[PDB]
Amino acid sequence: MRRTHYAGSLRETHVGEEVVLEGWVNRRRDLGGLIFLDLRDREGLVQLVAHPASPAYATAERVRPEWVVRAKGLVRLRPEPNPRLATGRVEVELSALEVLAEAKTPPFPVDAGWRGEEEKEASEELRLKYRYLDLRRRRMQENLRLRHRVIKAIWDFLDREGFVQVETPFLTKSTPEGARDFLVPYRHEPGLFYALPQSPQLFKQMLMVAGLDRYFQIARCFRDEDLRADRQPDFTQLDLEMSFVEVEDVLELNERLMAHVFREALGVELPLPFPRLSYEEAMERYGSDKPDLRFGLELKEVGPLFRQSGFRVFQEAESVKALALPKALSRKEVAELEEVAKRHKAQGLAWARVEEGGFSGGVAKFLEPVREALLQATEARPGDTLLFVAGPRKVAATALGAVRLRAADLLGLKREGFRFLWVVDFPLLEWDEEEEAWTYMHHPFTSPHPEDLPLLEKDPGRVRALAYDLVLNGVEVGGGSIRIHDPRLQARVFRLLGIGEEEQREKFGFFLEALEYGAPPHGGIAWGLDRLLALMTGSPSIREVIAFPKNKEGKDPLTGAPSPVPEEQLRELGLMVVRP
Amino acid sequence: MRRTHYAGSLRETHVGEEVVLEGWVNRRRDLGGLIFLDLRDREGLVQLVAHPASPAYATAERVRPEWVVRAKGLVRLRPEPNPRLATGRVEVELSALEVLAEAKTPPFPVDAGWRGEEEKEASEELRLKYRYLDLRRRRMQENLRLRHRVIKAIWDFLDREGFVQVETPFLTKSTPEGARDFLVPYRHEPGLFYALPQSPQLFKQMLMVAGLDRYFQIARCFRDEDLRADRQPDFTQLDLEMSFVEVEDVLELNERLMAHVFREALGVELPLPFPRLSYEEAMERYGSDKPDLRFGLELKEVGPLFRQSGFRVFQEAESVKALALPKALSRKEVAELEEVAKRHKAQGLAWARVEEGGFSGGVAKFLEPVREALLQATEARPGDTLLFVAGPRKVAATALGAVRLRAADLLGLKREGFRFLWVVDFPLLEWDEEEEAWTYMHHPFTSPHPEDLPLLEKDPGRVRALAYDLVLNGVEVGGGSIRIHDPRLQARVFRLLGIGEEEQREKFGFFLEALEYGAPPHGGIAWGLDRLLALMTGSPSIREVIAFPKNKEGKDPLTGAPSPVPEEQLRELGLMVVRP
Ligand SMILES: Nc1ncnc2c1ncn2[C@@H]1O[C@H](COP(=O)(O)OC(=O)[C@@H](N)CC(=O)O)[C@@H](O)[C@H]1O
Ligand SMILES: Nc1ncnc2c1ncn2[C@@H]1O[C@H](COP(=O)(O)OC(=O)[C@@H](N)CC(=O)O)[C@@H](O)[C@H]1O
Ligand SMILES: Nc1ncnc2c1ncn2[C@@H]1O[C@H](COP(=O)(O)O)[C@@H](O)[C@H]1O
């Protein structure tokens, strides 16, 4: 039994050796009297050859794709090297072959990728229903193995930096991360529930109050919220906290860590330190707090330039933001971008061609009377086309910010590599419109900027937080902040967030008490690990870097969960379904 | 701000350096116009000294226990070194001291352990209620940091052996491990529930079906079952699976893994290979499938010595188990061990002292007629006491077995170090008496011995399983098996387990179907990581090696979980509370 090597590990150096391989029949080809079988295992393919003389022939004759076999043979040099395979120079002449398991015909192929050939995408629902076969594809294995490598690299780095890995509870008390809690009924007292954690937040802070100076965990978080390609109800974060630190210490720690991860997993060198943008200029220059820096097209305020201009939209509007495309837009594209701008609360979109001494279409007429001031502000050249969106403040920036992303796609602009950036100076709060009150921008335990303290009642929304987001290619891959460690301030900010003394006691009593026993200053961050890996593998969604993810409905096609349970069982938990 | 060293790191090599330390005031001593503060942080204590001529004095005068401070000073050599502290040869002469956070008086002290003194164990319900202060104690931090070291050692080793770490789902389908599932209500369709995993069993096997080749995971597990000192409702396993292996392969891999963990985490060299005992030998020699080998008192069959004895009990019993105690028992103790034997279905216990040349006490007169054969069989020596339990086979063994354990306590038998062993050749099944049918001894996917197959439908109960438990100091720290990879055999065993073709479909259909797509032979094991660590740290329960555990009722006195939730919340899940 015991194999001597991994099928896909055989190289020229192995010629002459008798080997025992174990794997799956990737493909069978009857070519002449000979039978060639491509044996695969996780390290790749290797060609097996059965001659009619050999006792292995009868078996090689009966074999089908995905059948599991034990193969014994002599490694020989291929008279015809196959450049597309790592084992390409060699092949195994078979002396024996045993079938260990047969396999029904798979609902989709898994063989192409192992030959370097392109794979037709199968329906996701189908891939999910037979995830165990989907995970046989090379791309899927590369993804999981990269996930492994990334986490080991994180452990190696934080361990060396002195971090203590601590596992926090899953059957706990509710954590406010902005989402709904998944509940777990407590059998001995119907009506009582545990909440799965939205994050380890309160526990990692308590670990700081406990004197473990620095902590980390590959934490699983649960949030019963609306799901999309960057959202699973059950996800992973690289959670981390440090004591006696200031914003700089955290960000500096994270960059060295991230660069260690990219060097180790991708062999890519990240230039340090990462660029930084205040929440204002990121919102100014890109209409978003997770800027995609794989391309320019920066937003520019040109509202002053149109304070007395022929058309009313750029005249009446608070701000008019404009950017410059390096290529022209078709009129179906222009129509699209226009649709984009209106999905973001803006009236519409405007544009004009930048000629070699003038302007051409759209609103070019109104640009001529300001040509040298407008072309100065935009830096627009001849052959570009300017895009404009007017209206309020936020809306002009967000709308022309979204159209900036769409345009980069349509104009298929070079978007390669990784571009990280810290978005800092976020505002402490955020206005909840569906409930006429303030809520947290990140979470309630986020510390206000040491100064904006007075303004904490004068003007709630002008308060700066010691928060920060880590973004990669326009995706928020991490978020954290320095925490409030003074118990007074925490209850103050708690009141501001609308919670009364009594709710504070039911929801965070234990934690406010913890702050009174000598909490040191602390802060941290949490990366969305699934997101970071999706990006590191150029995957279209995080589902591609999770072994067994859920579909958009939060369901598991593979197992059938969530599924019904016998009445006796629910009854035993003192629960019953109020169904229609 | 930034400190220059960890308070507890200062050594003689640091004399003469100016330093910045940050930490907690472990204790304050006003000793004669001199103030001594013991500063503590994760790495230990340092003695800070404040002289009245120092700008630090006023502040050192105002501080209290558990206050967080920043201290600056010059490291000096102590005139009189304190042998009990790693920083004992030094002290730091303060030049500055700042209070960063005051603390209120702690409900229990946390300072003793850091001085190497002994701590009075406070109420566990109290330690739990303020777990963040409890975790300030040195022993708790040594426990958590040892857990970290152990997990990192597992990752370094398995990574080097080629194992892929894969994170498996928590909102998933039920997995049978012998317990009740914890459920999570799916809100978009009342009556539909996810089950937290009792283990990753089925996913780890499907991952073998997917061709990864060896997998592992530090997996959080959930079992709603009666709790106790070695049971938490949510615990951690080192979960592992391998393909194309036989029992020997899995055991060798685990032995080297475990050796590595001990070498790295404790600096202890485990002698390999671990001894092995079949289930039957373990029951014969110790009356337990989880022997504590830290002492002898091995059980001996001695029934054939009393087939014609004056004493009815030894005469008409199927077996007579004896053991030798190296010291004498008091009358109360003999009474206790007697009570212990009775609580295990045995009619009673018998004893007798082994005299130089004879026997005295209890049943000594019936021993004299076989004195040399008996002393032969028990290797008893003068000064010993022989213990006896008679009755049907398993009862004799089990009862004397339990008496053995209790006797080692009472006799305070010298139990030191770590004694591992593999208990192999478990039976495939185990009879369920409150059901009147067979169940699984481990779990349903456990493979029957390759040939006891006929005895299957025919002789259920005589069937051996390729299953194995790993035991340490009489505690089951791990369990696994080679699995069934043939889908027909799995269904056969499913039927035998009292599960009809239709239940098989709802509960394991996705899995049975997976075994039909070419599953390779595979097997694995799971360690109870909390149990391993409780044992590695000499802890009285696994709660001592979990940062935030539940108490025996499964409640969290720190947090208050589980707790009630608003009617609105329960309504939206379509659920309602009722009487069981
Ligand atoms: N549903 C989801 N599916 C997948 N990934 C998700 C999902 N939700 C979030 N993420 C990722 O987790 C990162 C951190 O989450 P936050 O809630 O911002 O931080 C927290 O949980 C704070 N306790 C961190 C801290 O303050 O230190 C996000 O940036 C994102 O990439
Ligand atoms: N409630 C609990 N609290 C704390 N520790 C626990 C608890 N229950 C179990 N353990 C520990 O985990 C080990 C493996 O669990 P098993 O159920 O034997 O096997 C399994 O789960 C199989 N899938 C393993 C396999 O076959 O690979 C036990 O030996 C024990 O130390
Ligand atoms: N199965 C047994 N094994 C050992 N000692 C026993 C057993 N049953 C009874 N004894 C002992 O035999 C003696 C007489 O028991 P009793 O007849 O109950 O008075 C007492 O020493 C009991 O402890």
From Swiss-Prot, chains A, B:
PROSITE patterns for this protein: AA_TRNA_LIGASE_II (PS50862)
Reaction catalysed?
tRNA(Asp) + L-aspartate + ATP = L-aspartyl-tRNA(Asp) + AMP + diphosphate
**Quick one: where is this thing mainly located?**
cytoplasm
Compartment list: Cytoplasm
EC number, as in UniProt? 6.1.1.12
The UniProt annotation places ATP binding at 223-225, 232, 476, 528-531
Query: What function does this protein fulfil?
Result: Catalyzes the attachment of L-aspartate to tRNA(Asp) in a two-step reaction: L-aspartate is first activated by ATP to form Asp-AMP and then transferred to the acceptor end of tRNA(Asp).
Q: Family assignment?
A: Belongs to the class-II aminoacyl-tRNA synthetase family. Type 1 subfamily.
Key word Protein biosynthesis present in the record? Answer: yes
Gene name for this UniProt entry: aspS
Signal peptide start-end: none
Q: Which UniProt keywords apply?
A: Aminoacyl-tRNA synthetase, ATP-binding, Cytoplasm, Ligase, Nucleotide-binding, Protein biosynthesis
- SUPFAM superfamilies in the cross-refs: Class II aaRS and biotin synthetases, GAD domain-like, Nucleic acid-binding proteins
Q: Where are the transmembrane segments?
A: none
Instruction: Name one process (GO BP) from the record.
Output: aspartyl-tRNA aminoacylation
GO cellular component term of the entry, any? cytoplasm
Q: Which residues does the annotated region (Aspartate) include? A: 201-204
Q: Subunit info?
A: Homodimer.
**Key word Mitochondrion present:** no
Q: Name one Pfam family in it.
A: GAD
Q: Which residues bind L-aspartate?
A: 177, 223, 442, 483
Q: What is the name of the protein in this document?
A: Aspartate--tRNA(Asp) ligase
NCBIfam families xrefs: aspS_bact (TIGR00459), PRK00476.1 (NF001750)
